[PDB]
XYZ file of C-alpha atoms in Angstrom:
692
model
C -25.500 31.981 93.419
C -25.704 28.260 94.178
C -28.834 27.344 96.151
C -29.616 23.676 95.471
C -27.240 20.749 95.835
C -25.818 19.225 92.646
C -27.691 16.234 91.296
C -25.994 12.858 91.529
C -25.359 12.913 87.784
C -23.908 16.432 87.948
C -21.514 15.333 90.699
C -20.304 12.550 88.397
C -19.845 14.994 85.502
C -17.918 17.452 87.682
C -15.725 14.721 89.170
C -15.006 13.069 85.806
C -14.149 16.281 83.927
C -10.573 16.435 82.657
C -10.136 19.998 83.988
C -12.252 20.251 87.141
C -10.656 23.606 88.016
C -12.398 25.167 84.998
C -15.824 23.839 86.021
C -18.783 26.086 86.807
C -22.037 24.477 87.954
C -25.567 25.890 87.928
C -28.739 24.128 89.055
C -31.582 25.626 87.021
C -34.024 24.944 89.869
C -32.311 27.816 91.717
C -34.058 30.355 89.464
C -37.385 29.622 91.172
C -35.857 30.937 94.417
C -33.626 33.679 92.963
C -33.963 35.259 89.522
C -30.311 36.369 89.664
C -29.012 32.849 90.361
C -28.527 32.263 86.634
C -25.512 34.056 85.128
C -26.293 37.062 82.980
C -25.213 37.143 79.345
C -22.224 39.291 80.314
C -21.266 36.917 83.137
C -21.689 33.807 80.979
C -19.576 35.304 78.189
C -16.937 36.394 80.704
C -16.792 32.918 82.262
C -16.867 31.006 78.980
C -14.970 33.193 76.510
C -12.637 35.302 78.665
C -11.934 32.878 81.529
C -12.157 29.707 79.376
C -14.408 27.953 81.885
C -16.744 25.052 81.130
C -20.215 25.914 82.442
C -22.626 23.069 83.219
C -26.363 23.783 83.387
C -28.474 21.191 85.222
C -32.204 20.872 84.485
C -32.691 17.433 86.055
C -33.896 18.371 89.558
C -37.559 19.065 88.724
C -39.321 17.294 85.852
C -42.595 19.232 86.154
C -43.791 20.257 82.696
C -44.696 23.789 83.797
C -41.350 24.118 85.569
C -39.468 22.583 82.639
C -41.005 25.151 80.283
C -40.365 28.108 82.603
C -36.683 27.290 83.124
C -36.158 26.616 79.420
C -37.865 29.895 78.497
C -35.564 31.791 80.871
C -32.528 30.035 79.392
C -33.765 30.714 75.854
C -34.502 34.394 76.512
C -31.185 35.089 78.259
C -28.803 33.131 76.014
C -30.709 33.160 72.707
C -31.369 29.437 72.149
C -33.151 26.634 73.975
C -32.600 22.888 74.345
C -34.761 20.018 75.599
C -31.917 18.179 77.368
C -31.243 17.524 81.043
C -27.707 18.969 80.886
C -26.023 21.663 78.793
C -22.270 22.236 78.733
C -21.185 25.674 77.505
C -17.619 26.199 76.262
C -15.795 28.596 73.942
C -15.440 27.997 70.204
C -14.148 30.564 67.689
C -14.958 33.431 70.040
C -18.586 32.361 70.553
C -20.609 30.182 72.904
C -20.630 26.469 72.075
C -23.575 24.523 73.504
C -23.218 20.785 74.185
C -26.602 19.363 75.239
C -26.648 15.827 76.604
C -28.591 13.444 78.840
C -26.120 11.275 80.773
C -22.721 11.675 82.412
C -21.342 8.878 80.214
C -21.810 11.086 77.133
C -19.146 13.561 78.326
C -16.774 11.235 80.204
C -13.251 11.865 78.817
C -12.081 8.402 79.943
C -19.828 43.958 61.151
C -23.028 45.986 60.841
C -25.384 43.005 60.517
C -27.147 42.288 63.845
C -27.123 38.542 64.422
C -27.051 35.996 67.238
C -24.226 33.508 66.683
C -23.446 30.304 68.563
C -22.275 26.731 68.022
C -23.750 23.319 68.815
C -21.489 20.300 69.268
C -22.395 16.615 69.065
C -19.998 13.867 70.152
C -21.134 10.259 69.639
C -18.530 7.570 70.324
C -19.473 4.316 68.599
C -19.045 1.327 70.895
C -17.357 -1.960 70.036
C -20.772 -3.643 70.131
C -22.145 -1.088 67.665
C -19.483 -2.006 65.075
C -19.602 -5.737 65.871
C -20.672 -7.984 62.993
C -20.452 -11.698 62.315
C -17.001 -12.799 61.171
C -18.593 -14.680 58.269
C -21.494 -14.090 55.896
C -21.483 -17.494 54.184
C -21.213 -19.264 57.576
C -22.429 -16.520 59.908
C -23.485 -18.981 62.632
C -20.074 -20.704 62.791
C -17.194 -18.210 62.870
C -18.100 -15.864 65.730
C -18.057 -12.075 65.680
C -15.604 -9.203 66.066
C -15.565 -5.388 66.035
C -15.213 -4.153 62.453
C -14.211 -0.623 63.552
C -11.657 0.827 65.960
C -12.364 3.894 68.122
C -15.210 4.892 65.806
C -16.628 8.318 66.537
C -18.889 11.106 65.288
C -17.709 14.570 66.369
C -19.385 17.554 64.709
C -19.869 21.271 65.369
C -22.779 23.183 63.822
C -22.661 26.953 63.348
C -26.009 28.676 63.921
C -26.873 32.285 63.075
C -30.153 33.988 63.991
C -30.658 37.137 61.941
C -33.135 39.185 59.931
C -32.986 40.249 56.295
C -34.774 43.409 55.184
C -35.876 44.069 51.615
C -33.335 46.188 49.736
C -32.071 46.505 46.174
C -33.089 47.079 42.577
C -36.343 45.491 41.401
C -35.753 41.858 40.482
C -32.594 41.567 42.616
C -33.740 42.639 46.090
C -32.873 40.884 49.330
C -35.676 38.965 51.078
C -37.727 40.374 53.942
C -37.627 37.385 56.274
C -36.366 36.067 59.584
C -33.351 33.818 59.020
C -32.031 30.744 60.825
C -28.765 29.649 59.196
C -27.104 26.316 60.029
C -23.659 25.518 58.653
C -20.807 23.040 58.850
C -17.990 25.167 57.431
C -14.210 25.245 57.105
C -13.644 27.862 59.815
C -15.531 26.150 62.658
C -15.715 22.439 61.798
C -15.473 19.674 64.363
C -13.217 16.642 64.147
C -15.546 14.744 61.812
C -16.413 11.071 61.462
C -13.864 8.296 62.013
C -14.259 4.526 61.693
C -10.748 3.048 61.536
C -7.076 3.903 61.098
C -6.555 1.019 58.655
C -8.735 -1.744 57.226
C -7.847 -5.266 58.349
C -9.497 -8.577 57.477
C -10.036 -12.128 58.712
C -9.888 -15.308 56.622
C -12.178 -18.315 57.040
C -12.734 -21.613 55.277
C -15.562 -24.104 55.067
C -15.695 -26.562 57.963
C -16.641 -29.339 55.517
C -15.308 -30.913 52.336
C -16.239 -29.053 49.148
C -16.128 -29.720 45.418
C -18.410 -27.161 43.712
C -19.115 -24.727 46.537
C -17.849 -21.716 48.420
C -14.799 -22.828 50.399
C -12.980 -19.648 51.503
C -14.076 -16.254 52.798
C -12.528 -12.933 53.825
C -14.341 -10.365 55.976
C -12.821 -6.886 55.735
C -13.129 -4.103 58.312
C -16.107 -1.838 57.752
C -16.338 1.365 55.720
C -18.987 4.063 55.372
C -21.457 3.082 52.671
C -22.877 6.560 53.226
C -22.766 9.584 55.485
C -26.085 11.398 55.874
C -27.185 14.725 57.356
C -30.904 15.493 57.693
C -32.336 18.896 58.644
C -35.923 19.042 59.934
C -38.241 21.354 61.876
C -40.933 20.828 64.499
C -43.509 22.955 62.638
C -44.029 24.746 59.321
C -43.132 28.232 60.583
C -39.783 27.872 58.787
C -39.040 26.818 55.210
C -35.825 25.991 53.383
C -34.751 29.116 51.491
C -31.234 28.332 50.235
C -28.731 25.509 50.660
C -25.310 24.443 49.522
C -25.012 21.906 48.022
C -27.738 23.115 45.649
C -27.231 20.437 42.988
C -25.889 16.939 43.521
C -22.093 16.738 43.686
C -20.172 14.169 41.653
C -17.380 11.826 42.672
C -13.817 13.185 42.707
C -15.143 16.711 43.274
C -12.489 19.095 44.647
C -13.756 22.615 45.304
C -13.786 25.268 48.020
C -17.195 26.916 47.641
C -18.007 30.391 48.945
C -21.650 30.053 50.021
C -22.842 33.662 50.169
C -26.240 34.824 51.404
C -27.407 38.404 50.838
C -29.265 40.278 53.586
C -30.700 43.779 53.633
C -29.531 45.770 56.651
C -30.077 49.166 58.242
C -26.490 49.983 57.309
C -23.221 50.950 58.944
C -21.585 54.324 59.415
C -20.773 54.553 55.693
C -24.435 54.675 54.597
C -26.213 55.703 57.845
C -24.803 58.975 59.171
C -27.092 59.173 62.214
C -25.904 55.805 63.541
C -27.706 54.837 66.752
C -30.210 57.676 66.230
C -31.269 56.308 62.818
C -34.713 54.729 62.597
C -35.026 51.167 61.312
C -34.855 51.373 57.513
C -33.194 49.202 54.875
C -30.205 51.144 53.535
C -27.731 48.545 52.218
C -27.112 44.854 51.618
C -24.299 42.633 52.881
C -23.137 39.174 51.846
C -22.612 36.688 54.676
C -20.256 33.973 53.443
C -19.446 30.480 54.691
C -16.524 28.560 53.189
C -17.185 24.917 52.285
C -14.338 22.682 51.107
C -15.281 19.477 49.285
C -13.093 16.480 48.407
C -15.714 13.875 47.564
C -13.440 11.212 46.036
C -15.343 7.904 46.177
C -18.630 9.606 47.104
C -21.321 11.530 45.307
C -23.374 13.967 47.385
C -27.134 13.647 46.918
C -29.514 16.434 47.932
C -33.069 15.396 48.809
C -35.894 17.707 49.918
C -38.786 15.674 51.325
C -40.871 18.829 51.861
C -40.508 22.571 52.422
C -39.195 22.003 55.972
C -36.725 19.176 55.281
C -33.453 18.767 53.395
C -30.855 16.000 53.519
C -27.348 15.595 52.124
C -26.053 12.047 51.620
C -22.447 11.247 50.735
C -23.179 8.023 48.846
C -20.495 5.529 47.823
C -20.202 5.417 44.032
C -16.567 4.570 43.237
C -15.839 0.992 44.346
C -19.200 0.815 46.106
C -19.468 -2.998 46.101
C -17.466 -5.839 47.602
C -17.146 -7.275 44.088
C -15.545 -4.059 42.801
C -12.769 -4.365 45.409
C -11.502 -7.664 43.970
C -8.124 -7.516 42.233
C -8.272 -11.225 41.323
C -10.826 -13.092 39.212
C -9.670 -16.729 38.983
C -6.818 -18.834 40.344
C -5.577 -22.372 40.644
C -6.776 -24.123 43.787
C -3.407 -23.969 45.571
C -3.520 -20.149 45.603
C -4.441 -18.795 49.060
C -4.277 -14.997 49.235
C -6.421 -11.950 50.092
C -8.189 -11.158 46.790
C -9.078 -7.577 47.773
C -7.208 -4.303 47.155
C -8.136 -2.005 50.043
C -6.086 0.784 48.439
C -9.109 1.235 46.150
C -10.973 2.583 49.211
C -10.295 6.261 49.795
C -9.413 7.181 53.410
C -12.465 9.461 53.378
C -14.467 6.221 53.672
C -13.054 5.119 57.048
C -10.198 7.272 58.392
C -11.478 10.860 58.454
C -14.523 12.508 56.881
C -15.261 16.196 57.461
C -18.670 17.175 56.042
C -19.448 20.681 54.800
C -22.851 22.205 54.048
C -24.922 25.367 54.465
C -28.648 25.444 55.268
C -30.715 28.645 55.314
C -34.216 28.571 56.812
C -36.637 31.481 56.495
C -39.728 32.594 58.391
C -42.178 35.406 57.728
C -41.370 38.880 59.032
C -44.432 38.659 61.321
C -43.793 35.128 62.622
C -44.328 34.493 66.343
C -43.962 31.542 68.680
C -41.074 29.107 68.407
C -39.699 26.330 66.211
C -37.397 23.406 66.973
C -34.646 22.662 64.454
C -33.458 19.045 64.311
C -30.211 17.754 62.783
C -29.713 14.004 62.285
C -26.112 13.058 61.454
C -25.379 9.426 60.655
C -22.882 6.969 59.201
C -23.965 3.733 57.494
C -21.365 1.237 58.716
C -20.755 -1.488 56.123
C -18.607 -4.591 56.670
C -17.151 -6.167 53.534
C -17.396 -9.885 52.725
C -15.780 -11.719 49.799
C -15.660 -15.415 48.971
C -13.990 -17.959 46.713
C -15.938 -20.643 44.832
C -14.378 -23.909 43.645
C -15.007 -25.387 40.188
C -14.014 -28.973 39.309
C -14.705 -30.091 35.763
C -12.930 -33.384 34.975
C -9.128 -33.096 35.020
C -8.771 -29.398 35.791
C -10.008 -27.097 38.509
C -9.950 -23.445 39.504
C -11.493 -20.988 41.940
C -13.380 -17.767 41.248
C -13.739 -14.754 43.537
C -16.982 -12.994 44.431
C -18.336 -10.128 46.499
C -21.504 -10.190 48.585
C -23.740 -7.122 48.715
C -26.660 -8.465 50.790
C -24.549 -8.546 53.973
C -25.681 -6.519 57.009
C -25.128 -2.807 57.584
C -25.744 -0.623 60.638
C -26.583 3.086 60.673
C -25.433 5.009 63.756
C -27.257 8.334 64.162
C -26.505 11.261 66.480
C -29.394 13.725 66.734
C -29.499 17.282 68.067
C -32.307 19.797 68.489
C -32.449 23.482 69.402
C -35.362 25.878 69.865
C -35.621 29.329 68.263
C -37.939 32.088 69.496
C -39.250 34.043 66.509
C -40.008 36.954 68.866
C -36.303 37.343 69.651
C -35.401 41.028 69.114
C -32.611 40.083 66.693
C -35.364 39.188 64.199
C -36.537 42.819 63.974
C -33.507 43.707 61.846
C -32.633 46.648 64.104
C -29.305 47.293 65.793
C -29.804 47.385 69.587
C -29.286 50.714 71.359
C -29.528 52.008 74.918
C -30.945 55.186 76.457
C -28.366 56.756 78.774
C -29.416 59.448 81.251
C -26.598 61.893 80.590
C -26.805 63.836 83.862
C -25.522 60.638 85.493
C -22.068 59.214 84.906
C -23.030 55.603 84.119
C -26.833 55.246 84.282
C -29.038 53.617 81.630
C -32.768 52.977 81.364
C -33.534 49.410 82.474
C -36.730 47.337 82.357
C -37.523 44.853 85.124
C -39.669 41.705 85.048
C -42.855 43.719 85.681
C -41.984 46.044 82.740
C -41.248 48.888 85.175
C -38.590 51.410 84.171
C -35.613 52.210 86.400
C -32.151 53.754 86.117
C -29.316 51.259 86.570
C -25.588 50.963 85.969
C -25.075 50.553 82.236
C -24.471 46.997 80.993
C -24.309 46.903 77.197
C -24.849 43.121 77.206
C -28.057 43.361 79.270
C -31.156 42.945 77.102
C -33.208 44.841 79.700
C -31.246 48.009 78.821
C -31.447 47.622 75.030
C -34.054 48.932 72.610
C -34.810 48.819 68.895
C -35.511 52.222 67.318
C -38.028 51.008 64.752
C -39.393 52.481 61.522
C -42.115 54.455 63.346
C -39.698 56.008 65.830
C -40.848 53.692 68.615
C -38.318 52.456 71.170
C -39.113 48.735 71.306
C -37.718 46.836 74.289
C -35.197 44.100 73.536
C -36.448 42.170 76.577
C -39.943 41.998 75.042
C -40.595 43.175 71.485
C -44.313 43.533 72.278
C -43.529 46.424 74.665
C -42.649 50.020 73.808
C -41.518 53.185 75.580
C -44.720 55.236 75.861
C -44.806 58.935 76.701
C -48.370 58.539 77.976
C -47.034 56.627 81.012
C -43.255 56.560 81.460
C -43.206 54.468 84.650
C -43.844 51.183 82.801
C -43.551 49.884 79.250
C -46.768 49.652 77.242
C -47.925 47.325 74.488
C -46.719 48.671 71.150
C -49.439 50.338 69.088
C -49.932 53.166 66.594
C -50.369 55.945 69.172
C -48.207 59.022 68.627
C -47.185 59.006 72.307
C -44.992 55.966 71.535
C -43.052 57.722 68.739
C -39.859 59.677 69.399
C -37.774 62.099 67.330
C -34.251 63.292 68.090
C -33.491 66.999 67.872
C -30.552 67.435 65.506
C -27.179 68.366 67.039
C -28.528 68.010 70.596
C -28.932 65.392 73.317
C -32.694 66.008 73.292
C -35.232 63.281 72.483
C -38.750 64.588 71.855
C -42.135 62.872 71.969
C -44.130 63.125 68.751
C -47.602 63.610 70.252
C -46.889 66.450 72.684
C -43.584 67.788 71.369
C -42.102 67.703 74.875
C -38.664 66.292 75.628
C -37.778 63.128 77.510
C -36.457 64.163 80.907
C -35.109 62.206 83.865
C -34.901 63.033 87.556
C -31.304 63.903 88.420
C -31.565 61.926 91.684
C -34.007 59.054 91.073
C -33.749 58.649 87.295
C -37.527 58.518 86.865
C -38.631 59.475 83.357
C -41.079 62.182 82.335
C -42.082 64.589 79.588
C -41.033 68.216 80.002
C -41.291 71.395 77.950
C -38.012 72.614 79.479
C -35.385 71.695 82.023
C -35.807 72.576 85.689
C -34.011 72.124 89.006
C -34.722 68.401 89.397
C -34.892 67.273 85.747
C -32.291 66.910 82.992
C -33.256 66.694 79.312
C -29.972 65.168 78.093
C -30.213 61.645 76.654
C -27.338 59.742 75.035
C -27.756 56.636 72.880
C -25.180 54.114 71.674
C -25.010 50.662 70.122
C -25.031 47.761 72.588
C -23.545 44.260 72.478
C -26.585 42.117 73.266
C -26.515 40.318 69.877
C -22.973 40.520 68.464
C -20.099 42.393 70.083
C -19.475 45.608 68.156
C -16.030 45.567 66.545
C -16.025 49.276 65.645
C -17.340 52.494 67.147
C -19.700 54.866 65.354
C -18.163 57.986 63.875
C -17.431 60.326 66.785
C -17.767 63.851 65.432
C -18.296 64.374 61.701
C -16.852 63.078 58.438
C -14.960 65.490 56.191
C -12.329 64.906 53.531
C -10.226 61.775 53.196
C -10.325 59.090 55.871
C -6.914 58.484 57.465
C -6.407 54.898 58.639
C -3.746 54.659 61.357
C -2.806 51.458 63.174
C -2.167 51.558 66.917
C 1.452 50.681 67.636
C 3.042 48.618 70.378
C 3.057 51.705 72.621
C -0.778 51.549 72.708
C -0.758 55.346 72.886
C -2.511 58.196 71.087
C -0.646 61.410 70.257
C -2.653 64.624 69.939
C -2.003 68.355 69.645
C -4.762 70.203 71.488
C -6.050 73.691 72.210
C -9.532 75.166 72.027
C -10.207 72.012 69.967
C -8.324 68.954 68.672
C -5.783 70.279 66.172
C -4.275 66.915 65.211
C -4.569 63.270 66.231
C -2.409 60.231 65.561
C -0.972 56.968 66.827
C 2.692 57.970 66.369
C 4.404 61.183 67.441
C 5.529 61.938 63.879
C 2.300 60.826 62.153
C -0.345 63.390 63.128
C -3.257 64.176 60.797
C -4.819 67.628 61.014
C -3.557 71.156 61.602
C -0.167 72.459 62.685
C -1.228 74.341 65.826
C -2.023 73.131 69.309
C -0.026 71.802 72.245
C 1.233 68.226 72.062
C 0.096 65.586 74.552
C -0.396 61.822 74.701
C -3.227 59.518 75.784
C -2.638 56.022 77.175
C -5.169 53.503 75.859
C -4.456 50.951 78.607
C -7.496 50.576 80.850
C -9.815 52.827 78.828
C -13.450 52.008 79.594
C -15.231 54.558 77.387
C -14.617 57.543 75.113
C -16.888 60.600 75.059
C -16.867 63.041 72.140
C -18.057 66.604 72.777
C -19.352 68.646 69.835
C -21.121 71.953 69.361
C -21.029 75.314 67.618
C -17.372 76.358 67.571
C -16.075 79.883 68.114
C -14.969 79.678 64.446
C -17.642 77.875 62.430
C -20.608 75.582 62.871
C -20.873 72.123 64.414
C -17.415 70.877 65.347
C -15.858 68.143 67.455
C -14.002 69.942 70.240
C -13.142 67.396 72.955
C -12.508 63.702 73.564
C -12.741 62.402 77.138
C -11.189 59.028 77.983
C -12.595 57.346 81.101
C -10.535 54.582 82.706
C -11.611 51.581 84.762
C -10.158 53.034 87.977
C -12.301 56.139 87.388
C -9.543 58.447 86.143
C -10.488 60.709 83.231
C -8.267 62.498 80.715
C -9.718 65.012 78.251
C -8.073 66.327 75.086
C -9.374 69.463 73.445
C -11.725 71.738 75.345
C -15.378 72.667 75.806
C -14.786 76.310 76.779
C -15.066 77.877 73.301
C -18.249 76.101 72.195
C -21.993 76.577 72.647
C -24.919 74.149 72.388
C -22.647 71.264 73.359
C -23.742 67.649 72.895
C -22.020 64.317 73.464
C -21.670 60.851 71.980
C -20.396 58.002 74.160
C -18.546 54.924 72.897
C -18.023 52.152 75.460
C -15.232 49.645 74.867
C -16.136 45.982 75.457
C -14.096 44.102 78.023
C -10.882 42.468 76.775
C -11.013 44.545 73.581
C -7.963 46.249 72.072
C -8.031 49.367 69.912
C -6.079 48.551 66.753
C -7.068 51.130 64.118
C -8.151 54.768 63.984
C -10.059 56.410 61.141
C -9.492 60.163 61.432
C -11.218 62.882 59.405
C -9.508 66.270 59.419
C -8.918 69.375 57.329
C -5.810 71.571 57.226
C -6.813 73.105 60.590
C -8.669 70.737 62.934
C -9.652 67.122 63.479
C -13.290 66.631 62.472
C -14.071 63.024 63.397
C -12.659 59.766 64.691
C -13.730 56.119 64.548
C -12.182 53.269 66.540
C -11.730 49.712 65.259
C -11.377 46.927 67.820
C -10.254 43.312 68.074
C -11.857 40.860 70.489
């Protein structure tokens, strides 16, 4: 929905864009008239990542402080991060959202199992000719005019940001922290273009406009280099503190190293350590290492780490090798007739002017009970330094010579590009839980959804909609992802209630069923088969179904693998999906064998052969129950396609106490690997690995 006209500045941005066909414009003032005017997370990801559009958000229409805060809060809640800028461009970078906040149209004129929120922030600061203009002379600065000492100078950087939670896990003395984590990185796999000052260093020669005997008489001003590059990380309040950084110690000159900066987080665990999957309560069960790769080639520069306080850290690439104009001289004395450039610019590494790509890793922590918000500020700068050298004449009696000198008091100019983003500590990703939904199984595609007034309804499932996602916490409460202060309460199931210690807010799954029970009363969660309204029931009846299905959602990070459908038994069989994009299966009363190639089937020898086409599959449903021969057993897999067609392998006829698990494939995702558990008779479980 577009309701308001574009601002004058937005019209300039749209018209000046290099690819205007890929533009998508949104005036944030529209949200006051229509809550659905803003794109949902699914729509924004589809536009930005799948369709490769450039989405422009416009906050410039109304400058009211109350309105500014409301629109920013809506943006922050929906997309995970907030900015205090009039405009925000959103584009795709490394499969994630890249935010480019800016103020003026001139700034953009081209002429696994760990739950975490990932995005990128880009800064692009062209440096004007005036900003690299210095006097042509230092000895005679008022006489020789001025010139630009750089050419097409530019700062272009991309910051990787991760919002995540670490739980405490591990042996005493080596346990992971229990803290909310904001991680900011400039790494090898997502870096921007870097900082550029010049393709090659030129110079200009000048002489004294007066006769000289014992005086400076000649000067050379060389194109500028970076005396330093600096990167400062700050916060708006003390809710966050620096926990870990790389660099940790100062780096020396001529340092060549690719550093793996690993950070250990405690997690609720994947399918390997948590058998119950989506039905598992929040509990630390494993630790994972999240690594960022940082390549250093410091050459002329040492890297100095400075921590002003617990909230601030800075990294400065400081010139150490050939750091002075004097050090660049390759001549010391000469006869007076000699007239030549006394400087060897080959002593200046190209990292100093041609291309510099900084790398660093900053990990902030906040307490596990932190609330409110914090702004994170990054100041990236280059200290532009022109180079001046001079020649001094010496006459004694009957001989003479000149000596060469460097000047270090000459002017410098620091150009800084700043960026700031806002983090909500109440974001559900900071609970450490993997988001899940509550699907009303009597319906085909209905999930529990919370509206703005916290009322509960049944809506078409959208696994990227926060209103349909919950966190199954350590007490068995179902905490809403839209508001972590609200919980699903059996005392009143028409509206979410403030989370507390009451037993009516705690839920327990009945093993090997689709039945979710309330702790206080022992009754089961039921839903009306027509309206979807929730209630507590001691049994099913004509109007009410007691079947609830839960699965992992994609509100934080898109799931790259399904949970284990069925059960694990024996050796896991990894099978890659071939170019046919087809599954081969021998079926009967159950699934005898399953495979990706007609010859390569894992399982038993019986059953009737058939094939399943993976093209257009929207979801996969696994049916299990007590088999005619044995206990709990996977007996059927149902593939549902986007057109609505369904194909089922196996059967449900020879089973009792049937229950289902549903795995929904994300859009534009390809199945590439199958993990199949089977004995000599039947297939026991299957897990799907995806690529996005």
